[PDB]
Design a protein around this ligand. Structure first.
Ligand code: THP
Ligand code: THP
Ligand code: CA
Lengths: 132, 139
């Protein structure tokens, strides 16, 4: 008889990190300027589902490095991620599924864009901002 | 200066007939034995794709099963039967008219009759691929 052997599915998307092909090689990217709840926190599954749909349904993904630091201390490419023109970082925050975080000079070009989205999500008391 | 946008592509765990799995401690792309699934730009591609993704993403236990002939195809893909909680994905897609039996070679054809049988049945119910008129006309 043939023999069954274990294996486990690879995950490209893990919270604020996504594994993409860049310059013909795989690379781990960590979304700039945001902090998304983990799968075991409130809104964590919702934020994962939103990211998955946004990125898997994109014909075109682009990354935009900022000017201050290309890679964090853990080897992750720090970037804004675009799915068919729309910034994933911004969309999450707009939907109240991520907060603005890790904002540092040099790597904070789109900070105002994100703070604007966050203000709107808080005013709407949406998702993360629905809690007391 | 404005920042510049650069291209990249999503790394896809599931893509057509291929699945990327961690196997003996290392990542490996596998090609499902004995089947041909429509690609995402072809009809039922997004369906066959969703059914695969459902089956495999929701599995608690994934297994691979190599056959007795070629282990790796000429594109560097491991050739295997893929199981999700004990149910073979290869067989399931064929039974659900979401893939055709194909690429059947002596040595790597242990499950040929199981699948051909599933394909035979799949036509009669006329589901998905086989729900089109004359889709079973061998064109
Ligand atoms: C987003 C981001 C995170 N980080 C670091 C800070 C955290 O390190 P410390 O854990 O050592 O405090 C970590 C959070 O990433 P994750 O949220 O992916 O874990 O990544 C940066 O250094 N720069 C950044 O721009
Ligand atoms: C299933 C299978 C495919 N292949 C090859 C045949 C096709 O090569 P050609 O492209 O040269 O025709 C290709 C189809 O794979 P995909 O259907 O995943 O694209 O993989 C094998 O060599 N052995 C197999 O067992
Ligand atoms: Ca195919």
């Amino acid at each position: 008889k043939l023999h069954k052997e274990p294996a486990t599915l690879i995950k490209a998307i893990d919270g604020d990190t996504v594994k993409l092909m860049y310059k013909g090689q795989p690379m781990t990217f960590r979304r700039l300027l945001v902090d998304t709840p983990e799968f075991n926190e409130k809104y964590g599954p919702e934020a994962s589902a939103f990211t998955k749909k946004m990125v898997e349904n994109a014909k075109k993904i682009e990354v935009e490095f900022d000017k201050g630091q290309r890679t964090d201390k853990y080897g992750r490419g720090l970037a804004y991620i675009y799915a068919d023109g729309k910034m994933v970082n911004e969309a999450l925050v707009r939907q109240g599924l991520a907060k603005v975080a890790y904002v540092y000079k040099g790597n904070n070009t789109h900070e105002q864009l994100l703070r604007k989205a966050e203000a709107q999500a808080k005013k709407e008391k949406l998702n993360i901002w629905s809690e007391d």
